[PDB]
């Protein structure tokens, strides 16, 4: 009965811990000690977007690194042109409690979702010229926190799942998490994806088979942000314990911890640069920190925002970094 | 470039005209300890989020319910930091301890320290129950002189209801510090004064915010 279930579960956990310890002799920091430091980086507010009305939760950069999507609590999904600071689209939302938004790689579809437990897919470009509602996925029971497009017909959503746009049905469910899943990221090859829940465990799921390949622990509080490395064999997690962590799928363990004594605020948004050298974490002290992925050093401070930073995104070509916060402002940094 | 500018100005004027009405709507977060009579209140006033629209004295009010959400309320509650008030309902008739703990959690939240809480004691069934073992401090409790019991009410019921009110206020006044205030009320499920009480509390909250804007409070 349950007692020996727990006993062999604990034995399996001990075996996993021993295997992880055996595979680790030297840390990434020791190896990267001998490389040149990144240095102090200065970023200036190139554009500011002030069209929003309430606090802004999520954003997604475009494929062309020029158009972006932003979501705020006023119930408006705003498509922005980052170059000339001219508004491209403004789509009213059925539910004002939108927490996440995604931009399709082809640029023809946009996802939104939130506390309504329903994900809405809109077609940006249509024959008649006005954005309509194209899909309405209402199979989830928990609040939607993150969504990402695999293709024009395949989407992955995070709730606290895989969906086909054509049929609008849940073809794959990713179960195993104990807490509410807050963040989700897509690998460059669109074959695996990591999901972080309201616990120390972050789980990697294969898109096709739909099972949990790997589970990573180490955090001390709820995990809020996750982002794949540009290489695709690693990812970074930002939690509420004022620490950021880097994990890799091949070794299945932690690389280093990015933290400071002066920081006691959780991390809400992480996004790697084009080369992966910068981590670009968003904190609750109204400012973002640029973390060196190899030396665990804060490259720069982005204190332009006045309220809590919720979303941070990096362009596909690594041209500019956009940041939205709990104030109705989106700021672009270089 | 101009072809983009007419669209940009159209979207700008649309956002301005929507902001003209967005600031005229007050958002309220309805919270309760499950079956604490909150649903009866919603039915009296009238799947993830259930929303109710009601206009009082030509002023719109938009209330949000918990809906079909899990018991893990740590995360999504942060989405209601900008609401006008949090109407928190307590079954005053040990669910009382759980309600007190939930009120303590809501009051002391870093993100919810700037929003006010309207405390409702919906279950006024103390007369039926005429409690002392659950709260040892109630045995030595004395009715404060500030109490204003209505005629025709048993003194023990008044003592118990103000004991619960003071038990809530001691947490409320422990770290209020003036940025947010709590407004307890001895209401009932079938009472028609809930709407008026919410109206008055919202007016008081907005007046206090205006005073704080001018540093008069």
């Amino acid at each position: 009965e349950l007692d020996q279930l727990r006993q062999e579960a604990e034995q399996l956990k001990n075996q996993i811990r021993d295997a992880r310890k055996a595979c680790a002799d030297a840390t990434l920091s020791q190896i990267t000690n001998n490389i040149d430091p990144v240095g102090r980086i200065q970023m200036r507010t190139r554009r500011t977007l002030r069209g929003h009305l309430a606090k802004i939760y999520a954003m997604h950069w475009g494929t062309d690194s020029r158009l972006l999507v932003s979501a705020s609590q006023d119930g408006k999904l705003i498509i922005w042109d980052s170059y000339t600071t001219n508004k491209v689209h403004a789509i009213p939302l059925r539910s004002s409690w939108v927490m996440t938004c995604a931009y399709a790689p082809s640029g023809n579809y946009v996802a939104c979702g939130g506390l309504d437990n329903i994900c809405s897919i809109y077609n940006l470009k249509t024959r008649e010229g006005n954005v309509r509602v194209s899909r309405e996925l209402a199979g989830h029971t928990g609040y939607l926190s993150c969504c990402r497009f695999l293709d024009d017909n395949q989407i992955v959503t995070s709730s606290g799942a895989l969906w086909d746009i054509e049929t609008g049905q849940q073809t794959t469910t990713f179960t195993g998490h104990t807490g509410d899943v807050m963040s989700l990221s897509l690998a460059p090859d669109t074959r695996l994806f990591v999901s972080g829940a309201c616990d120390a465990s972050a789980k990697l799921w294969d898109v096709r088979e739909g099972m949990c390949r790997q589970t990573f622990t180490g955090h001390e509080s709820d995990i809020n942000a996750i982002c794949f490395f540009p290489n695709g064999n690693a990812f970074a997690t930002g939690s509420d314990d004022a620490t950021c962590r880097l994990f890799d799928l091949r070794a299945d363990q932690e690389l280093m911890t990015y933290s400071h004594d002066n920081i006691i605020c959780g991390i809400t948004s992480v996004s790697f640069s084009k080369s992966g050298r910068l981590l670009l974490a968003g904190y609750d002290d109204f400012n973002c920190n640029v973390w060196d992925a190899l030396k665990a050093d804060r490259a720069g401070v982005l204190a332009g925002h006045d309220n809590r930073v919720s979303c941070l995104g990096v362009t596909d070509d690594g041209m500019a970094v956009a940041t939205g916060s709990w104030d109705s402002f989106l700021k672009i940094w270089n | 470039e101009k072809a983009q500018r007419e669209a940009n100005k159209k979207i700008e004027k649309q956002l301005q005209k929507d902001k003209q009405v967005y600031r005229a709507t007050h958002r309220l977060l309805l919270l309760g300890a499950g079956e604490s009579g909150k649903n009866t209140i919603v039915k009296q006033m009238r799947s993830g989020i259930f929303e109710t629209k009601f206009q009082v004295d030509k002023v719109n009010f938009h209330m949000f319910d918990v809906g079909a959400q899990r018991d893990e309320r740590r995360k999504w509650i942060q989405c209601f930091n900008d609401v006008t008030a949090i109407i928190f309902v307590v079954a005053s008739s040990n669910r009382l301890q759980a309600a007190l703990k939930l009120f303590d959690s809501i009051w002391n939240n870093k993100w919810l320290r700037d929003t006010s809480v309207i405390l409702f004691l919906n279950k006024q069934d103390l007369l039926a129950e005429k409690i002392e073992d659950y709260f040892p401090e109630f045995a030595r409790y004395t009715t404060p002189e500030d109490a204003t019991p209505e005629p025709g009410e048993d003194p023990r019921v008044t003592r118990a209801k103000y004991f619960i009110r003071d038990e809530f206020l001691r947490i409320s006044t422990a770290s209020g510090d003036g940025r947010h205030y709590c407004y307890p009320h001895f209401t009932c499920s079938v009472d028609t004064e809930n709407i008026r009480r919410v109206f008055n509390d919202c007016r008081d909250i907005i007046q206090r915010m205006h005073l704080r804007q001018y540093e008069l409070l």
Partner: nanobody
Amino acid sequence: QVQLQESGGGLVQPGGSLRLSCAASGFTFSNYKMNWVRQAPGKGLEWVSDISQSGASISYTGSVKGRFTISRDNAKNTLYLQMNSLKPEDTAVYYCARCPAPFTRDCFDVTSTTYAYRGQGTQVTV
């Protein structure tokens, strides 16, 4: 990873005394407020007591006020709970819980079901 282990308990006569221990692993003891919560058979989880990070703020539920006491030791990363003058009403499974967020003077979802930061818990009967 985060893990909480409860030790002690057992079968004691009514009106006796027993001491329960909670051991924490995977996080700093001093950075989180800690809780004891009981769940009676056939009933839901009921909060018992809370202790702050430094132990300055300590409170108990009214049901066991004046009988049960709680203390914490950060150096040993352990929490102690002493029970005196036991009652048949206090027959329940006990769980040592950690507040989800550090450096926060409050915490949510302590008594919520399927809580991640909760220990295995021990049955105490009289």
